[PDB]
Design a protein around this ligand. Structure first.
Ligand code: DGD
Ligand code: DGD
Ligand code: CLA
Ligand code: CLA
Ligand code: PL9
Ligand code: LHG
Ligand code: LHG
Ligand code: LHG
Ligand code: LHG
Ligand code: HEM
Ligand code: LMT
Ligand code: HTG
Ligand code: HTG
Ligand code: OEX
Ligand code: CL
Lengths: 137, 243, 34, 334, 171, 112, 97, 30, 37, 151, 34
């Protein structure tokens, strides 16, 4: 098995356009995700609210859809509750709240894209492990 | 005006506020005004358990017990609606609060009796025509007593209701029937009764205090054994407020 | 049959304790010089 | 001489069948109190709410235990690290429900055993001996401290201290493995090297000296009668024992020097066990065993399990099952 | 080790326990004997480092057995007085311990375990308030088995759906 | 006596097979798969996210041969009891009274 | 005679759909747009005599009503089961991942 | 009976401690 | 310590052993039925 | 936030799921953390009233910065492996973290221990040297040989 | 508790038989000429 261009091809938007990430992008994504996100989201779960995970199906049923690059980049700029009803930047790391979540300060657009790509690719690799929690360790 | 650091470790935190002996006034009820109990506090001072006689035709009494779970017994920060009824009676409807405490008391000879001391969903009413709450006002009512353990609770062999084994796995080929009562967990929900006798009234601040007696069943270990009857006595404090 | 459950140990000890007392006494007698 | 002087002379007397001494002056009553309370509790104490969730655990013989299952049960999680002497309880019944016996026993015992160590120094001084037997004893003592005091401090509750019973000890071990992966901790591994090695060298030394006993007896008598207490001559030929062992491996692997050899015999298990104690005492502050969970990954990113991951699955079983009604939130943070 | 705990309850086994007594007792004897010899040494030189003041060929004991005996008699109540017995005993304890552990493992070969105490189980099955450290450890074992078996025993092709995995609250 | 062979079926009438207990295990879960090893039913520990309960899947058990021959059971408790016994292989009726048997497996003379 | 009420309830519609009267709130994450706003309102205003009664929660926006209508097919109602609704278990039933 | 047995064996062991210590055969120097 | 002058050696000859064992065994043979009851 | 009344929520054991009493009555956090009720911190103290945690304050006064801080601290608990894998011992690799509190506490326990050992060593030796038998027992003047036997 | 009914006599003979063996040997050793 290998990390192929096909594995690294993920939905860019809701309209069926894809984008193919480079291996450097994938590595940057893992690094940045560990840097700014893994403290709560290690393995694709959510420690401070385990009801919500980072599985692609879950993101797809989110509002607005979060199972593509644009959705995840937007979430990292202006995170909402699962129904899209509330903006939660005040209690969730984002560029909008980089003042109170300082690790968000040196994150570039390029970075957000890499993180997004990591979140989308990783379940293609790990399957049910991603968002599975300890049952699948 | 005591701070948390004045109080911590003293045992005062498990005590309800008291009213001075001067508090013998009347708190007017404006029947056109809505009211709320901003804080109801109940501090148990005695737990009595009804003994279970052998002939089943004897007069069973409530006997004293020794508290063994320390100063963890009081219900407090209870709030709710205080309705003015058509006939002039008042009705407290409990909405929320720290309105339960698991308590274990010990009988002479060592039998321990756990109970969920509670006024959950209390509805309690006065006599008719209460134009003022006075030292003659009393509240009488009923409350719910849910299972002492909730549905996830696992016994020492890992059996439970909403989780756990549904059998005695250490006895793989034992006959099931004899073990049914221990294997099939049940969630009890019964009624309790309570009286509040107002002894003191600050008609200016709307504060009242007095004594209470409540009666309710004890823990039944999720249906494994019969509950005991418990009578709880203590003091209470309440702050009445226009809502 | 429904016998008393302590009958077994009672009997065993009834035999063994005084028998053993005697055996101790006898053997230490034999082991004395002459 | 005055009464106090006489008293001192007696206390520190080298002629008492059991040496008292000043450390003994503290040791004797504390060990007696710990012992008495322990025996009474082990036989007759009622169930104790170890985890503070009104779920009392039965430890004593009269309440349904045998020798293997029985224990004096650690004090309640509700107490945490609070000092809970008898006079803090409203009654002996409360005291017993909350695990008071445990605290009385382990505190009196830790003091008493510390004084036992001191007393070993003291008598060595009175007898004109060199002083370091007590240093050897510091190893089991440190271990005792680790499991009865330090680990509770670190975790914030005497309810997590080792139980005074056989099965309770095993409980402590399994939960420890769940929460610290102690088997993958190098200090525990050094501890294992310490006691396995201690056993090895015990047997080895025993057998080497026994092999070279000088003939002093006939075949119908025990060879032990060939040694007489206080005789000035050594009772075995160390040159012959060394000839043997040196040939068993190679010559420079073996000790020709008895002092060097016995020092080795002292140092290996003592140091190993020092590290076992320090292992418990530092996992007390959650610096845990090596974690190689999902450390090996293939070219795509598939996890390739190692034996570490199987260990992890076992630990997961322990973790999810232990204290099954005590946790309400997803992380076991102490 | 963990497999033997989860599946055999090996810590409960009296043969393993004798094994432990022999290994820890062996370690204790190693330690105490080494330390005792080193601290009852005769002054046989002028050095503060005392190792050189020994000669393999010397006739004399290099430490005082009499002082050692009095020390331990007054400290522990009893003491070796016979060196030959001392060293034989040092052979005997760990060797016997290991032999006993061997007997236990031979039992575990047939799943002939010391897994349960039957009286315990009868009481606990009938009485949902009866709890000991023995029942606690069995719960731990059950966790180990369910959570480790599918990867540890891949030839069995175990699929244990989430809902059947034994778990306490929250964890 | 032999109770007869237990055949388990779900509401769709698919035959399901109880996973047998391996000798290693003092206790063992109750899991039913189709002929391809696909999990179709089980007895859940945690109930709140159960998908495969006998109640949800309408599991029944019919017996063939033995004393329960020709009989069918549909009430979840009974079906579950028999599933529990099916993890030990074929199901038998036992006299546990004559010897005050305790329901815990003992080895044979081959073992001893 | 003795019955595990939760197992029993698994054989009702409760084991097939989101029971507006009993099911733990995390279940509303299954479908688009229900969590957390509508889920909180629904659990708050329980119990309901029929599923469509969920539409009568006071204060509901038109969008909210549309989403509810879109999801009625995934809802059911059964008798309130004490064991499932005590202990605040509808907000937190002790299950995480 | 079980409890009585356990406590009895323990008690015999303590008694044994006593005799092994205070009524030991005295070590004698040759 | 001065040795105690009151000490005396004890004896049980073989015939006494046989008599004693006979007594014990026959008493047990007699009382055991009543012990099992 | 989801609608729970955390003051009246009874947990599985009968104790409050979120809130319970300390043995002296103060309102404290429930679950295992009942052991830690002596904790005091700038992010928690505004919720504390004279009787402990205040239900009204809990219901109405919790600020976003408090949520943030609690989440941060919960997710940086001082637990982690020797190779600095953050979290409980069963956690998968991903977060590179061991708390400085763990490093400092463990290091200084080790050092304090060995320094106690060093104290015993050098004290015992100083005694023996001052009395003059640190090099061993004088064969011709062995003290025990001049003492009466124990028995 | 439902213990094994043979446990008592098993334990009793386990202790007494070898203890008695040792006591016999000891006493007859003491009685040998000094
Ligand atoms: C007979 C004689 C008796 C013998 C008994 C044996 C007793 C001692 C045994 C020692 C065994 C040493 C094994 C070395 C294994 C190893 O390869 O060790 C590897 C580790 C590093 O492991 C790596 O650690 C990483 C940590 O990841 C984390 O960090 C990463 C970035 O660093 C990423 O961010 C990642 O996402 C994040 O999870 C990953 O897990 C990697 O997979 C993993 O390989 O080394 C480290 O931790 C380095 C720091 C710790 C070293 C400690 C060594 C032992 C210390 C005590 C020795 C005795 C002292 C006596 C003094 C007198
Ligand atoms: C078998 C071989 C060993 C044989 C025995 C020899 C005796 C000594 C053995 C020492 C180990 C030898 C290899 C050391 C390599 C190493 O350590 O490598 C590890 C690091 C360097 O590697 C870096 O290690 C880091 C450790 O994480 C740290 O940094 C991270 C990233 O910033 C996080 O901040 C994290 O929170 C923090 O812990 C990261 O993993 C980095 O990715 C990685 O590059 O060396 C360091 O730290 C420097 C180490 C300083 C000494 C430790 C001081 C504190 C010790 C406390 C002791 C108390 C109890 C101990 C019990 C055991
Ligand atoms: C050697 C004698 C001795 C010692 C040291 C102890 C020690 C202890 N007992 Mg025990 N006890 C003893 C004999 C002893 N006991 C006897 C004979 C009995 C039967 C009567 C008891 C009956 C008993 C009960 C029923 C209980 C205890 C308890 C305790 C603990 C708390 C005591 C306390 O609060 O004192 C505090 C008193 C002081 C601090 C005053 C001393 C001040 C001096 C003069 C100066 C300060 C010294 C300094 C701090 C350290 C010294 C430094 C050193 C280098 C010199 C403590 C471990 C309690 C317990 O175990 O709780 C968990 C408990 O409940 N004891
Ligand atoms: C007070 C002592 C102390 C403490 C608490 C720390 C703590 C830390 N160091 Mg620092 N450091 C120290 C002393 C200390 N160090 C010393 C003496 C040096 C020079 C070697 C350094 C040089 C150093 C570097 C270059 C780095 C750190 C780093 C770190 C961090 C990661 C540690 C790690 O992964 O260790 C790994 C654990 C070990 C290697 C295990 C050590 C176990 C020892 C050997 C056991 C000793 C026992 C005892 C003393 C032996 C006695 C023998 C006995 C017979 C008596 C951590 C915060 C890293 C970091 O993140 O920096 C930002 C990093 O890169 N440290
Ligand atoms: C078919 C074919 C090819 C046939 C060929 C056969 C043939 C003739 C071959 C010749 C060529 C040949 C030999 C090839 C060899 C191949 C080879 C390299 C094999 C290696 C095998 C192997 C694994 C060897 C391992 C050796 C090994 C592990 C040794 C143990 C090491 C070890 C830990 C030693 C401990 C050392 C130590 C400090 C001990 C102190 C503790 C101790 C024992 C105290 C006790 C003690 C000691 C005393 O000292 C005295 C005094 C007394 C009182 C006393 O108490
Ligand atoms: C100097 C280093 C010290 C290291 C820690 C202490 C080790 C020795 C302590 C054992 C106590 C045994 C009980 C008393 C036993 C006893 O009575 O000892 C007696 C023995 C001989 O005493 P002497 O009086 O002849 O010499 C000591 C002083 O008086 C100075 O001459 O003491 C020594 O040999 C000291 C050795 C120093 C060097 C030892 C280093 C060994 C450890 C090296 C590190 C290994 C770590 C491995 C980890 C992977
Ligand atoms: C302040 C005092 C503190 C200590 C008080 C308590 C000390 C008790 C010490 C044990 C006394 C009994 C010894 C009998 C046996 C006895 O009297 O032995 C005495 C014996 C004397 O040896 P000698 O070398 O003099 O024997 C030479 C010849 O007789 C050989 O045939 O000592 C040893 O053999 C040491 C090894 C055995 C050490 C065994 C110790 C076991 C520890 C206890 C384990 C069981 C505990 C069970 C708990 C329920
Ligand atoms: C609290 C627990 C206490 C446990 C300890 C209990 C230990 C009690 C030991 C008592 C056993 C005494 C045995 C003495 C046995 C014995 O030594 O006999 C021989 C003995 C002869 O004594 P001499 O003066 O000749 O001295 C010889 C010396 O070697 C004896 O020490 O006569 C007596 O002891 C007087 C009474 C004997 C009566 C014997 C009658 C037996 C005849 C057969 C009866 C059965 C057949 C009936 C057929 C129908
Ligand atoms: C005579 C055979 C007795 C041994 C049988 C047990 C073997 C165990 C497995 C092998 C381990 C080997 C380790 C020995 C190490 C070894 O090689 O030993 C050698 C030793 C004889 O050695 P030596 O001739 O050098 O004599 C050394 C003596 O002088 C002591 O210094 O053999 C014995 O000590 C026999 C006594 C063992 C007695 C064991 C205790 C038995 C307790 C039984 C309780 C049963 C209760 C019954 C209730 C009804
Ligand atoms: C790191 C920058 C980071 C990313 C990226 C990230 C993503 C993320 C997503 C996409 C969601 C939505 C999940 C879904 O199924 O719809 C989400 C939700 C939550 N996260 Fe997050 N997150 C990042 C960082 C962090 C950190 C550091 C924490 C912990 C403090 C955290 C926690 C949460 C929580 C809580 C939620 C749920 C919020 C809600 O809907 O109420 N995240 N995250
Ligand atoms: C569970 C059942 C328990 C039953 C236990 C019964 C115990 C009975 C103890 C019997 C004790 C015999 O007591 C023993 O007597 C003999 C003489 O007979 C003494 O022997 C002494 O006198 C004889 C004279 O022949 C000398 O040879 C010997 O050298 C001398 O020591 C022993 O020193 C003493 O130990
Ligand atoms: C010498 C003191 C021995 C210890 C005394 C045991 C506690 S006293 C014991 O307590 C039990 C439980 O309360 C009672 O049931 C029982 O009647 C009573 O005797
Ligand atoms: C409601 C359950 C009805 C079905 C009976 C259970 C399965 S079979 C049952 O199992 C017992 C062992 O547990 C045997 O002792 C008994 O002989 C046998 O009838
Ligand atoms: O207490 Mn005894 O065990 Ca130390 O973790 Mn947390 O808490 Mn409990 O759980 Mn896991
Ligand atoms: Cl918790």
């Amino acid at each position: 098995a290998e990390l192929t261009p096909e594995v690294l091809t993920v939905p860019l938007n809701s309209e069926g356009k894809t984008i193919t990430l480079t291996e450097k992008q994938y590595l940057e994504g893992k690094r940045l995700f560990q840097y700014a996100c893994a403290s709560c989201h290690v393995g694709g779960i959510t420690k401070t609210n385990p009801s919500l995970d980072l599985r692609t199906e879950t993101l797809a049923l989110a509002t607005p859809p979060r199972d593509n690059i644009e959705g995840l980049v937007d979430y990292m700029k202006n995170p909402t509750t699962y129904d899209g009803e509330q903006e939660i930047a005040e209690v969730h790391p984002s560029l909008r709240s980089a003042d109170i979540f300082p690790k968000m300060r040196n994150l570039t657009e390029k970075d957000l894209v890499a993180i997004a790509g990591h979140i989308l690719v990783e379940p293609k690799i790990l399957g049910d492990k991603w968002g599975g929690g300890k049952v699948y360790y | 005006t005591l701070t948390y650091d004045d109080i911590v470790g003293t045992g005062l935190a498990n005590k309800c506020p008291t009213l001075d002996d001067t508090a013998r006034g009347a708190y007017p009820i404006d029947s056109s005004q809505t009211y709320r109990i901003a804080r109801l506090c109940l501090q148990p001072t005695t737990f009595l358990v009804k003994e279970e006689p052998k002939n089943k035709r004897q007069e069973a009494e409530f006997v004293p017990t020794k508290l063994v779970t320390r100063e963890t017994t009081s219900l407090d920060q209870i709030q709710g609606e205080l309705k003015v009824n058509s006939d002039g009676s008042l009705t407290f409807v409990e909405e929320d609060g720290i309105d339960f405490q698991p308590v274990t008391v010990q009988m002479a000879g060592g039998e321990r009796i756990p109970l969920l001391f509670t006024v959950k969903n209390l509805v309690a009413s006065t006599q008719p025509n209460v134009t003022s709450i006075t030292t003659s006002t009393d509240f009488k009512g009923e409350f719910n007593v849910p299972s002492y353990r909730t549905a996830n609770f696992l016994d020492p062999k890992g059996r439970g209701l909403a989780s756990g084994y549904d059998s005695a796995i250490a006895l793989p080929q034992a006959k099931e029937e004899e073990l049914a009562r221990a294997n099939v967990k049940r969630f009890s929900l019964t009624k309790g009764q309570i009286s509040l006798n107002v002894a003191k009234v600050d008609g200016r601040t709307g504060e009242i205090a007095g004594t209470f007696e409540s009666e309710q069943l004890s823990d039944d270990d999720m249906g494994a054994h019969e509950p005991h009857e418990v009578k709880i006595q203590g003091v209470f404090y309440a702050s009445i407020e226009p809502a | 049959m429904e016998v008393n459950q302590l009958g077994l140990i009672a009997t065993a000890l009834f035999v063994l304790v005084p028998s053993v007392f005697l055996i101790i006494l006898y053997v230490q007698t034999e082991s004395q010089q002459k | 001489a005055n009464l106090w002087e006489r008293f001192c002379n007696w206390v520190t007397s080298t002629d008492n069948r059991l040496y008292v001494g000043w450390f003994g002056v503290i040791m004797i009553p504390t060990l007696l109190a710990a012992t008495i309370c322990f025996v009474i509790a082990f036989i007759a104490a009622p169930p104790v709410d170890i985890d503070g969730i009104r779920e009392p655990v039965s430890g004593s013989l009269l309440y349904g235990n045998n020798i293997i299952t029985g224990a004096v049960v650690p004090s309640s999680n509700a107490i945490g690290l609070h000092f809970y002497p008898i006079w803090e309880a409203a009654s002996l019944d409360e005291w017993l429900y909350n695990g008071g016996p445990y605290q009385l026993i382990i505190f009196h015992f830790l003091l008493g055993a510390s004084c036992y160590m001191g007393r070993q120094w003291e008598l060595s001084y009175r007898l004109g001996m060199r002083p370091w037997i007590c240093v050897a004893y510091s190893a089991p003592l440190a271990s005792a401290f680790a499991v009865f005091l330090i680990y509770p401090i670190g975790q914030g509750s005497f309810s997590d201290g080792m139980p005074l019973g056989i099965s309770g000890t095993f409980n402590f071990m399994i939960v420890f493995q769940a929460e610290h992966n102690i088997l993958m901790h190098p200090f525990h591994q050094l501890g294992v090297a310490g006691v396995f090695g201690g056993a090895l060298f015990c047997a080895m030394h025993g057998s080497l000296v026994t092999s070279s006993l000088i003939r002093e007896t006939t075949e119908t008598e025990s060879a032990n009668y060939g040694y007489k207490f206080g005789q000035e001559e050594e009772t075995y030929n160390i040159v012959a024992a060394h000839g043997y062992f040196g040939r068993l491996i190679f010559q420079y692997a073996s000790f020709n020097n008895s002092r060097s050899l016995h020092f080795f015999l002292a140092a290996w298990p003592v140091v190993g066990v020092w590290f076992a104690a320090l292992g418990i005492s530092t996992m007390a502050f959650n610096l845990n065993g090596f974690n190689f969970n999902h450390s090996v990954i293939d070219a795509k990113g598939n996890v390739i399990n190692t034996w570490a991951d199987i260990i992890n699955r076992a630990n997961l079983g322990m973790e999810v099952m232990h204290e099954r009604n005590a946790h309400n939130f997803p992380l076991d943070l102490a | 080790l963990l497999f033997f705990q989860g599946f055999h309850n090996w810590t409960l086994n009296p043969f393993h326990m004798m094994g432990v007594a022999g290994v820890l007792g062996g370690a204790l004897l190693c330690a105490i004997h080494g330390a005792t010899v080193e601290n009852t040494l005769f002054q046989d030189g002028e050095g503060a480092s005392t190792f050189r003041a020994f000669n393999p060929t010397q006739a004399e004991e290099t430490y005082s057995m009499v002082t050692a005996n009095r020390f331990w008699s007054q400290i522990f109540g009893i003491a070796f007085s016979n060196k030959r017995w001392l060293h034989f005993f040092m052979l005997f304890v760990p060797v016997t311990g290991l032999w006993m552990s061997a007997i236990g493992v031979v039992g575990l070969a047939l799943n002939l375990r010391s897994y349960d105490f039957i009286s315990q189980e009868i009481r606990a099955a009938e009485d949902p308030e009866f709890e000991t450290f023995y029942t606690k450890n069995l719960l731990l074992n059950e966790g180990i088995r369910a959570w480790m078996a599918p990867q540890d025993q891949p030839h069995e092709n175990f699929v244990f759906p989430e809902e059947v995995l034994p778990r306490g609250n929250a964890l | 006596a032999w109770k007869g062979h237990a055949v388990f079926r779900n509401k769709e009438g698919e035959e399901l097979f109880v996973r047998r207990m391996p000798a290693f295990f003092e206790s063992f879960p109750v899991i039913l798969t189709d002929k391809n090893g696909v999990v179709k039913a089980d007895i859940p520990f945690r109930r709140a996210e159960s998908k495969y309960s006998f109640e949800q899947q309408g599991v029944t058990v019919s017996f063939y041969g033995g004393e329960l021959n020709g009989q069918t059971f549909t009430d979840p408790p009974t079906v579950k009891s028999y599933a529990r016994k099916a993890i030990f292989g074929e199901i038998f009726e036992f006299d546990t009274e004559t010897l005050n048997s305790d329901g815990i497996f003992r080895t044979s003379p081959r073992g001893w | 005679e003795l019955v595990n009420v939760v197992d029993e309830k698994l054989g009702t519609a409760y084991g097939e759909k989101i029971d507006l009267n009993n099911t733990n709130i995390a279940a509303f994450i299954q479908y688009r747009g229900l969590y957390p706003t509508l889920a909180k309102l629904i659990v708050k205003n329980a119990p309901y005599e029929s599923v469509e009664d969920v539409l009568n929660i006071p204060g509901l926006t038109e969008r909210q009503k549309q989403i509810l209508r879109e999801n009625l097919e995934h809802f059911t109602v059964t008798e309130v089961e004490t064991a499932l609704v005590e202990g605040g278990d509808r907000y937190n039933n002790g299950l995480y991942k | 009976m079980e409890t009585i047995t356990y406590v009895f064996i323990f008690a015999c062991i303590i008694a044994l401690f006593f005799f092994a210590i205070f009524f030991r055969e005295p070590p004698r120097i040759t | 310590m001065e040795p105690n002058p009151n000490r005396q050696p004890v004896e049980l000859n073989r015939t006494s052993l046989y008599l004693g064992l006979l007594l014990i065994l026959v008493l047990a043979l007699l009382f055991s039925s009543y012990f099992f009851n | 936030k989801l609608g729970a009344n955390v003051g009246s929520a009874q947990g599985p054991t009968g104790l409050g799921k979120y809130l319970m009493r300390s043995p002296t009555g103060e309102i404290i956090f429930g679950g295992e953390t009942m052991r830690f009720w002596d904790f005091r911190g700038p992010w928690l103290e505004p919720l504390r009233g004279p009787n402990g945690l205040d239900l009204n304050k809990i219901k109405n006064d919790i600020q976003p910065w408090q949520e943030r801080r609690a989440a941060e601290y919960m997710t940086h608990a001082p637990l982690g492996s020797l190779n600095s894998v953050g979290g409980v011992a069963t956690e998968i690799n991903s977060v590179n973290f061991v708390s400085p509190r763990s490093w400092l506490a463990t290091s200084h326990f080790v050092l304090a221990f060995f320094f106690l050992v060093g104290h015993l060593w050098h004290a015992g030796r100083a005694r023996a040297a001052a009395a003059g038998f640190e090099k061993g027992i004088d064969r011709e003047s062995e003290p025990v040989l001049s003492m009466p036997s124990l028995d």
